[model samples]
Target chain A: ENKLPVLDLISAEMKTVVNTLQPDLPPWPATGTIAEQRQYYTLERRFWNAGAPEMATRAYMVPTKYGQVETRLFCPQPDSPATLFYLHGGGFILGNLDTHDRIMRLLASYSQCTVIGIDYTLSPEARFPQAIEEIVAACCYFHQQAEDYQINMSRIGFAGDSAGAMLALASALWLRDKQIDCGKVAGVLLWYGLYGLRDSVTRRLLGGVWDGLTQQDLQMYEEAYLSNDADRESPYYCLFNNDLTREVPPCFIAGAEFDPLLDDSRLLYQTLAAHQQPCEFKLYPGTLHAFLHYSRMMKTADEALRDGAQFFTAQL
Target chain B: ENKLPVLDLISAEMKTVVNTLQPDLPPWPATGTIAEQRQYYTLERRFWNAGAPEMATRAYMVPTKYGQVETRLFCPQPDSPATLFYLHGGGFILGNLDTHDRIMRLLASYSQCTVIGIDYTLSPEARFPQAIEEIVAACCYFHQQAEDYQINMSRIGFAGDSAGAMLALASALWLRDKQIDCGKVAGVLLWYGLYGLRDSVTRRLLGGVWDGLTQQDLQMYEEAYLSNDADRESPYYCLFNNDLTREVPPCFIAGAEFDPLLDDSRLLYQTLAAHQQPCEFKLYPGTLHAFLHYSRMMKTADEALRDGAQFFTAQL
Candidate 1:
């Protein structure tokens, strides 16, 4: 008598896409130089945004601790209710303003909030704490020159996914630890964040049919980001190992059903809730690790955008 | 300019299911005892199959190296074209005949192949070698007595998801090492397999938005599965570390775009291909880890089933 009717509910169009496009997609070269891999990703967006969307975008370079960090502002209107300090995910090695530009625009359009996507220094070039420093600098820069962007300083929030999510969420923790005006980031939107090192939750991800990331990719990324041994136990590096006891801003965390970082969201939500902090955790079932980036193609991504926007909107 | 038209393609019904049911889902108790956590999983499938499928399923017990392992056969018709040696995913500790029954029926129906689901010994109780031993015993038993079940021994193939995939794929390697008729396995259908420990590809998973497994969980599962420190370098436990010079069966390996084990499929496919063995790798997008269970609800799962069946059929 065991049966599953969910398959019957899937739209034929989605199934055709999955079956058709999956086979035609090219595989990443198993043997490639880092530069080649990086180049491959640079062109990955063309097909993802084959048609592209229309939105107002502004590009500028902001001075940060690591050096000059290029930042792009995605503004849906002339001015917005709040401004989100955004970071992109590439395991600290791959993402930049251009790679995440599409998502930034969707965030701005869906949330109706100005999104400032940061192109922080990547790993192997900048290393772990350097990216962290640059993120902190970016946030502080916004706090210092919020008026220059013509935004409300009181409504600045933080957002990121994966490694980016780690920085976004941990920046708040670091800001509080540094005794800065951490209150500027009213809330955060984290999508499938990597919060700790060598966690079993990550291994759980190894059991599924599809996951966006792999253990080997994680090894290179972590090594590149860490570069040298720092206090792995510190909150500045491993957020999971730190005392989440410190106050964090209201947070909206989402994770994929097949992702290792699913538990990171669960862990953060649990820890924050235990500490009586405002937090919300969402799980997108049958979705991959970075499904959020495919907002143009996936309904779940669109839904996440709406929910994230609503979460940020509510915080303001 | 920024745009994401993919969101417009999401099925409205699926969207409703996520938004409406997600909030109402229970949060795993943060302070619960281990028994509570285990017990929660025991009841997880009731809702997944709140509505059941119709299938002709036969249950029986089979003797194996560890003990008598339980088995179930999902047959869509009285007789079938081919058979699949299916294993379920639960990190070598969880899942059994009942837990994965829904997916088994889906496999039988979708692939048009007789699905034989095995209930192998779990970690801690059975240990690493024991589970591997039991799996080997089951496969041999099938080979020796294929006609007893009214199936063609010539068309017997192996299929599994996650930990189950690990065992299925590794067992093929183990069979080759043991000098058994490994050729009995026409091909293998691996869904996001976990091939080894401390893999660079696994680390690559950390780069994504989320991964379902955590390092801590992996440590526990690995410890439980590998109770004693039997040679970790052996191909039995660490498939990634093994030599691929041995002749292997054709393989159809698939991975989710956002999963930590995504690279496992890639690595295995690359290795098998390099060795001049037949191998095919498929990547599912907008899906999460261990998506096989959602066959009823996820269109991708259904697509995977069809592909797996086709792969097995082609080999025959």
Candidate 2:
């Protein structure tokens, strides 16, 4: 494996413990099968699970219009001041229930709040607007049945990483336009999200240091998730075009410095701030996309989680 | 006496009481001086003072960077949950501290919260961004000296009618963008504000009916408040251009059906809703801009005040 300088940007403890665990799988065709990519990504989770912090968690299916989607509840107690509707990342095709389990548990523990993970349908099978519909449906169900689950509907929130972050934003936007109670989403936590239509910043890297994310990765993700008929300019797909001139909740956005999607978070933060939305943006030095996934070994990831948790809890 | 059909839109009691109170003032040149308009507006207060509801209010001037601006404080008790930083309406050319006294008292009485009225500088004297800067400056001083004034900074709010409402929105946006403790402004109440660059719904009125407002009137006010080089598209002037996607405090927006700025409030509500901000929108059927000034005689104005007060108190 070619040693990358980005490793030095992370904690020394993480570099040693994290470096040894990096899967040495051979690069595959960009147009790889879903199963092949899923298996490869699953293999990358060993690092996340190695020193993953444990929490009192429950797994169940949340009945939505999209069918019984698997859901996980991470709670520090019977109930909390708030509950977070969380989504995991894998360009909408790879990640599943367990991929972000540890990160969710860590977030729940740190926020001292309940975290509800939605296992949305992956792409190729599920096209562009499908996940958004499912996400909105799941959120509706959660809010509707909040009392049954001992959840505070008034203190509900949304949090996600990567594609999940995009879905989280879309769901919030949908709920708002639908005239639903936007006050319910007290805070939004977006981690290394791909929101802008602007392509990978690594294209501009020009022999400079870059991370694993590339323009090809974006094309692969877009191809599987967005159908030919979908409007790429729609705010639902290209968030940068979305009319953000509305009442969004206070937000926390964190990005990896070395990721191609770094500019996505930066631009979103700038938009939020310019529009006078209460938002906090942070960039982790020398890191790449999804560093928070390996938070079990990464100090920076834990810090981001802790800070995001604090922001959300304060809103509640 | 001319019997206006719009009177029927108001409460039955107001139809008779309000009809008898209408002044028979002669029309003046449209390009009237500020002194001439101020005198005329001051004389109109005779209508507001008729059976006005009173509160335990005290008049004072708060010192700020924009110079010591006159202020008024209305309270239901010695201390309240929060203080509403209030601004009065007069097209930014007329009105004063006493103009909104009855309305402010009504608001304070309804919410059981303190209302602090800022005697902001009128237009033709302070142009473009000056009022916004002053509004924000007053808010900053109030929050900084909250303890001194027995005010709860965390529970403070911004509220105003007409141009005052515009100032309230602008101040909130300014504080938010400045990264100040805008969170302290728990609520915002804007009444029949001219928020859009889009002229008026009254334009549709054509030859059917007319209120005391027109596109020419807006242009007149715009000319006074804004200099030639001022960007009308600036969110500070035409709020429609302000990015609504940021974190705005819980808001209560009301519009008068007979008012030319009716669409401004409706569009702003739609924008607030689309941006997922917590907001309540109300349109009073039979009123014109600054109807709340006559809240003592107008039941609809009283209702709007009570509703706005309820929304603000709920946030507190």
Candidate 3:
């Protein structure tokens, strides 16, 4: 293996030992006052947009496969075009639908798509395929019962960011394989997603974020996600796998220039494009994995999400 | 607004308040941990890439448009066919060649392009246009010294990630208007970047990483970077202000999924695509910005960088 450009300012001992262990770990822990930073945000997010406009639908839950999927109704309107089944990001950990509830409400109204959010279990706990299973179940359940909410199944689209986007892509592949004909599934909107581990790029771009990650760490998660760990040939998880020949669903994939997950999304697009799959792939200028939720605050993101909605709607 | 779907287990606060600024500021003698966090991260970043390889050329301090520039030169075979003036990303107020020095060293060797890294001035202290000028001047200088490097002046490219990518894009615009015949430049490689303030999208996306950088924060940076305030509309900073009909260098762009810089990179692509400019845009399937620095460590990144190189080289 070729070496990297070493840290010059730090000492050799620091490099071989302390720094090597946790390249980007903080020098001190923010255990005290930083706790208060929990709510350290703008008045609007803190006060004005407390939750969302009252116009938001009163329903807090949207039914799905695994269970009662939650939905954030953003607008005041009773009628919406279709439902957008969204999964929360966080590389399959940390983030949940609640964090982005605000976004759901706004996007639902703006896109005129009722939002059915699936909160699958997270990692370091439930582990890999469990989350993927939950997301797939949610989308399946929603598509099966689209008429329950006065919508067409074909009008239902899948949209997710970060880990959630991974869920969306996996769901697309899974459903397509199941012959579920999710092609009527109104396309997919992924804000950064990795189909598989084939590309073998993990974690953030900073490289220092490599701490707490190891082979066992990867194996543990891989075990939970794949039924046939030995086959590893499935393109669903390993997007850049050599055998990726199937045409995928139309997709609107967005990526960040500085994100670690950039390659995963790229392979998704390329794999799809290799099969001449219709894909709308773009790397947004100044946003991150978690930014899609804040579209309510950042108009640019809201607009970008709208592009996703438009693409989905157009596909339908 | 539609009411948000309530999650059974997720933290509502983590979802809503992660990146907002509280109306109440910390009282004088201002508190503890968040402050400690700030200091900790700063210290932590100082220890980045301590285990990476050593570059042939140690980064040196040199005078430039900014106070002084830290530079490193890497070549495939000592003055290759292409010369890339690589700019470092610091999010306007942070980072330097030191943070990304290792990555540049790798690019110099792996891509086999003559990589001339410009440390360039940073923000707050050096101001905006100060860094911008440094990069532009560096580009112009490379344009003149292309022959010395034994590289085709027409094959010179500008590359940057985050703010560095911004410099690359903005410099392309500046050079185009300056009638510098940016054609010889061939490619503008952007690994995510900042292009507009439309809203606090960046703040929303990176509120956790860069603090509250809403539209106001973007405006402040703009105020500093532009030579004249109106220069904001000069197509350099605000590519969205008008149709990008001007002739610009071909661009090779890449981005990630978990980055706050996603929106900007997307906009840059859209602008370039709309203008019918020659461009090669690829968003990695699921990676972070600056992921390319680890050419040897992360397989996908090395592949992506090689792909980026191929795009630039192919264009030439």
Candidate 4:
């Protein structure tokens, strides 16, 4: 008899929540347009994205060479010196500033730093390097006008979840490669993000309809984000292909136990450690991909956010 | 910056409990006699080992070739057919029927089976194969008189925590090697146990003043359990050296995230998976070694016990 080991190992709360919520959120329509899918995704996340901590908030239209990108800044204090530039995750096709508002607020509250949420252009429309380019541009804008935002350019960190986490890391590497002196890029917080893993045991075994990360779901995202198979081998697109021997900031990598991208976090952490970089790896057991989004009911989410903030603050 | 990763990753409750309890429980004296150390260990566990659920419990002196080993049986219901053979952990030196009484009761209650706790011979006075021999003899004794104890030999499982976990596995392996068909080991429940790992990152990085599993403490236990270095290579003594390609029962392996012996559980799980043997692994994040002992304050312990029971019951 085949036993579902991941289901058996997940937390009781997680099991209850998934069963309760899965009925309300059906799978994305195969024939639906990208706009319709994005709307559906936003409406679904509204259930868990409420009650963000009080903070001073501002909106900015960051000018990038690719285009003007929307961004939101959450500052726990008026003149906070440190900043965490956050990118939201939706397989590079689904999330936006509103989708990850609560997470940014939590990071700001916990780390006591200003947090910037980047609304990078979605894929199939922008594809590979576009998102990364927009993120780098946003960072440059903030760095040049640090005083206008009451932020210290020297104490900046990059953070993101899922595809956004990939963008966060790639942005840092791109800035380094382009020799852009935007900010120090003191650290990076990566949560359950993919990093150049084409195949893994977890990839084969984990993910289901509940987490919206089934093999087919992941394949759709990959196809939407890359123009061709050759883009899959790009170091900027596939972080696993990147050379860790080069200069990289300290990292706090978090992964859900039931995520296919879990192997990516492990491999990245191992590579970072091998290069003698300061890094921490946390694999939250009994959790699924995007578990952080369910912060209202899951203690693991708060714990993960706290850990990431602690790591980022320590780096600063 | 040198960050304490284990401490940072532990649950808030675990961190608070350790901070509160560590002050009262001093380390074992290097100069104390074995009897004195055993007494100290029992007293130290008294705080968290109370409030066992009501059950039909009985004591017996199981006649074994090595000696008359003490045993306790906790029955959740009269005439329970299934049985769980449990061994308590104390580095193979300390612990008895009283130290692990609550654990056995919980397993019995949760699994709805008769649970027999084996108080095998402690180390120094009896080392290595001596404990394994006593366990084998005890299993044989019970299987021969299964009806007398209201147990069904056909539905038997082995279980243990820490040092006792090693004994549980070794006994199963020993029975298989000797072709002793006492009772089929339907499954096993292993909690944060060692499986022949000599060195590991967790061993070096985990374990501290709080958990009482420091490097020195582990070394002391090893020295007390083994007669010589050669014994370390014994397949029966170090389960990692055993042949997994042969017949082995299904296993439910649980490991504490912050435990130094975490690698043992990982390696064992990997080995079992490689052999295509049925197994389930749950690494309880934000937990420490012997966390199951603090069931009163820890939710992870109860979750782990319930998961183990679920696996064992499924095997039947």
Tens digits of per-residue lDDT for model 2, A71-157: 788878775888798988888888886788778888888888889888888988988787777777777777787778666666778
- lDDT (Cα, tens digit) per residue for candidate 4, span A74-167: 8887656578999999888888988898999999999988999999999889888888888888988999998877777777889999888998
Q: Candidate 1, after superposition: displacement of residue B140 in Å?
A: 21
Over 4 Å off, model 1: A1-27, A50-53, A205-212, A229-231, B1-316
* Candidate maximizing lDDT: 4
- Candidate DockQ values, in order, are 0.02, 0.01, 0.01, 0.02
Error in Å for residue A197 of model 3? 36
Please report how far candidate 1 places residue A123 from its true position, in Å.
1.6
| TM-scores of chain A in all candidate models | 0.88, 0.88, 0.69, 0.95
State the lDDT of candidate 3 residue by residue for A157-253, as single tens digits: 6778766777777776677666765326667888766555431222311112232223344344456455676545454565444333454667898
Write down the DockQ of candidate 1: 0.02
Better of 1 and 2 by TM-score: 1
The single-chain TM-score for chain B of candidate 2 is 0.88
Write candidate 1's Cα lDDT for B1-316 as tens digits.
0111222333453333334344454776548865565566656654664444588788878898557988888878876777788888877777777777777777778777788888887666776777777777877787688878776566667789999998888887788777877236788889888786453333423322133365556666787787566655567776765666456778889886656566667667766665577888888776656776666677787788788878877887
Instruction: Name the DockQ score for candidate 2.
Output: 0.01
Docking class of 4: incorrect
In model 2, the runs with Cα more than 4 Å from the true position are A1-316, B1-18, B21-32, B200-202, B206-210
Candidate numbers sorted by lDDT from highest down:
4, 2, 1, 3
Candidate ranking under TM-score, highest first, comes to 4, 1, 2, 3
lDDT of 1 by residue, A1-316 (tens): 0111223333443333345453344577548867776776766654554444577778878896556878888778876887898888877877677777777777888788888888888778887678778877877787788878676667778898788999888787777778888337789899888777554433423422234455565666677877666656566777765666546789999976656566567667766765677889888766556666776677787788788878998987
